[PDB]
């Protein structure tokens, strides 16, 4: 799985339709250097949970994302759930579209419309 | 010169022009020890999409800022055209588009070469 950002940011996947997968923050969390889960990195969270599905269905590159908002934000001890769901991937062209939510305690904290990648 | 930042690190090292609830254009220079590259090794580091927008969404409420609290809230539309790589300088610049009693766009070049679009940023308050 192929990514630019440095971590990989799901600790566990939990076919051409749709993936769920976790992430417990934590007060280690590498993702900075020396406090909670900034938004664009739940952005890059649901972005490789999403590629491994794609993966699961040949490299990829997130091309462009849309419709994202943040309802709240996550803090250490907090369990990210992430959820991405296939809309399509015609290889006509080569593009794939995914959608993705993410939860904590069952609450969403972050919604995607939509996430490109080719 | 500091203000809130929701990301620990500032991805701007420079502004180079503003004129209030309108327009901006600051300026980041990709060093080769920066937090985000640390993390692997010799090969080919690459400044990664997403802290692109991170960077423009500082840039972008810099400006929010000049014209209260800014909370990043959640963005459309955004393109990555091109890599950023280090010793690049990335050229950003936002633009005022509502104050709805907060949304900008965002544009970011690399040699006058665009390597980043976002059509929208929101910025709620408080």
Known sequence: LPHRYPFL???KVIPNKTIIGLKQV???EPFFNGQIMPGVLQIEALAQLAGILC????????????????????????TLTMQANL???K????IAKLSGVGYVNGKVVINISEMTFA
């Open 9 to 11: 940011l799901v600790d």
């Open 26 to 28: 934590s007060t280690n």
């Open 55 to 78: 993966l699961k269905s040949n490299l990829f590159l997130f091309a462009g994302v849309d419709g994202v908002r943040w309802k709240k934000p996550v803090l250490p001890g907090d």
């Open 87 to 89: 809309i399509s991937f």
């Open 91 to 94: 290889s006509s062209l080569g």
